[PDB]
DNA sequence: GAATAA
DNA sequence: GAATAA
DNA sequence: GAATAA
DNA sequence: GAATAA
DNA sequence: GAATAA
DNA sequence: GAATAA
């Protein structure tokens, strides 16, 4: 939902692509994220082993090749990622409290588990965006910013604005003299929340503890579309600035709605009344 | 190995059986209803005057 | 007009369906009055203004409570709506009009399909969801509008015209 | 005679379009529940007996 | 199987429902470990699971 | 050329609904600079072909 | 019946 | 038009 | 001419 | 694209 | 979808 | 199996 696709959570996470990406800002107008594929790599799946005698307690890390990540999909709940800083947004030190893939009541998540030796890849196509139309240049520094989608669910804090909801009206400034009421009509994202949880065992002592070695792999593809070559402050009609989260509030909870329904523009059938 | 005997029993894949919130429930509000339609009268909503249909 | 004689029906169906691109009208118990089917129509009074939902492009904005907004933002097929009356024969008698009474039975049916909930709370979820063109504002009377026709118009250029060009 | 223009009009054939109470709706209930089961124990239901299903 | 039961319909009335319907064993299920005899009785097991129960 | 299309044949101040008003600028500038921007890029929503890198 | 004949 | 679009 | 050669 | 869309 | 849409 | 049996 965020962008933590230049790997932000730590400035050591910088490549040349993230580089050739912010020559690429510098030149161009305007950008679309075409598509983003995640893949996850899991090496290990390390449970630590808790043998316990009464008033004592051996601890030893064990392979297990029996469990699996999971990988969860909240398709079914209203959930939300709370952001404050680029760090904060990590694959792993990111948290939300009172949390679990596995609840003893009504199990929400849509799981894909993945085991030693396995992989969950998973694409997204971050183009969203018709009729001619592109993302602002950015270079992804901020976080808060959100990848391209029409999610229509904004907070009252930190309003993301026309560009998250499907059909765009915003103004672009142009300076003082100009403006430009940039605005499209784009088709709408749900983006559930992603997460990566352990299964959840009852030990003697609450629950087994899972610690995965993993490798994590994110590329993102990218149309920069480049600079005229003649300047055109008056192009920016077909930019549209990001999902961004604006506010002062230090913390920032971005949405995450699972699922756009589908209804019907059909007249019914099998309906017994005649009419 | 990791293999046990069972019916109706499969590997086990993706499975979260709550709809991603697309469910559509079709009734057809019906009103009959007889009714009069009075020129007749002085009163109100009873005169010469065209009596009409709020669609 | 459409007129009925005795043991003949008049029977009218509107396509309420107006709406594209995987939205819908919010949840409704229709115990309001001064709201409105579902319509583009573009004439709202400057008293008790419809808003976006009543205008062919929507844009508005959804609560979600306090700490979240919606711009459920949709494009929708304009709807004239025009104004429907039951009326007599005007006949002059030796005094005004002759004056009928009809009995009659209205039947008046209305095909929805209400979306029902997600199984898993999606405040969020009113991003799709529209709040029907029913007028607001104080005033007491409110006078809901018809408009007749929605004229057509070409893109299609010229034929038959005698200048050369 | 008895006459008249109209459109989608018909002969007044027998019309109660309320059904005669036949109608039917469809829901799954959905219950997913994460379980433990614990032998381990010596409370109640934690012990080394099979655990019920009640269908 | 052959149902004959008398519902009430308030005071007044009565319905002697009566239908025959096809008979069904509901045997018991159970959701057990093996049974291993450890040096002290048997070995505990406990099962992580998700049931999965849909209507 | 211009389609004028004409009026009805009753009032609809109510049709302006399909009528928009022109881009004409508005402001009290004596001057008024009219926006000229010389092209529209072509963007696309292909995705690659012929990049190296296999995904 | 480039000069407007639907 | 495993995540209910009759 | 999974390691980007349009 | 009887309610005028050459 | 001579004005760079791989 | 105009009176709604997907």
């Keep these: 939902q965020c962008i933590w696709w230049r790997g932000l959570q730590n400035a050591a996470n910088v490549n040349q692509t993230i580089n050739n990406m912010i020559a690429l800002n510098t030149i161009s107008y305007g950008v679309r994220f075409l598509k983003a594929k995640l893949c996850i790599e899991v090496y290990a799946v390390t449970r630590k082993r808790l043998i316990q005698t009464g008033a004592t307690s051996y601890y030893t890390d064990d392979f297990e090749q029996g469990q699996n990540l999971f990988i969860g999909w909240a398709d079914r709940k209203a959930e939300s990622i709370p952001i404050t800083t680029p760090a904060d947004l990590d694959e792993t030190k990111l948290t939300v409290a009172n949390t679990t893939l596995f609840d003893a009541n009504n199990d929400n998540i849509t799981k894909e588990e993945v085991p030693t030796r396995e992989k969950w890849c998973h694409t997204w196509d971050l183009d969203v965006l018709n009729h001619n139309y592109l993302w602002e240049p950015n270079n992804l520094d901020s976080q808060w910013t959100l990848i391209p989608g029409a999610q229509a669910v904004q907070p009252t804090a930190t309003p993301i604005g026309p560009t998250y909801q499907e059909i765009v009206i915003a103004t672009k400034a142009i300076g003082a003299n100009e403006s430009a009421l940039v605005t499209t009509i784009q088709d709408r994202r749900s983006y559930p929340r992603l997460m990566l949880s352990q299964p959840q065992i009852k030990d003697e002592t609450d629950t087994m503890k899972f610690k995965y070695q993993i490798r994590i792999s994110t590329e993102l593809e990218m149309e920069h579309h480049i600079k005229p070559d003649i300047a055109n402050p008056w192009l920016t009609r077909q930019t549209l600035p990001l999902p961004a989260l604006s506010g002062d509030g230090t913390t920032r909870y971005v949405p995450c709605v699972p699922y756009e329904t589908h209804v019907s523009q059909r007249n019914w059938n099998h309906v017994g009344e005649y009419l | ?55």
Excluded: C, W
Aim: charge should be positive; aromatic fraction near 10%.
């Design chain 2, 1 to 55: 190995t990791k293999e046990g005997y069972g019916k109706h029993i499969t590997s086990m894949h993706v499975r979260n059986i709550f709809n991603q919130g697309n469910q559509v429930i079709r009734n057809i509000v019906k009103q009959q209803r007889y009714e009069l339609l009075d020129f007749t009268g002085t009163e109100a909503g009873t005169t010469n005057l065209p009596k009409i249909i709020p669609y």
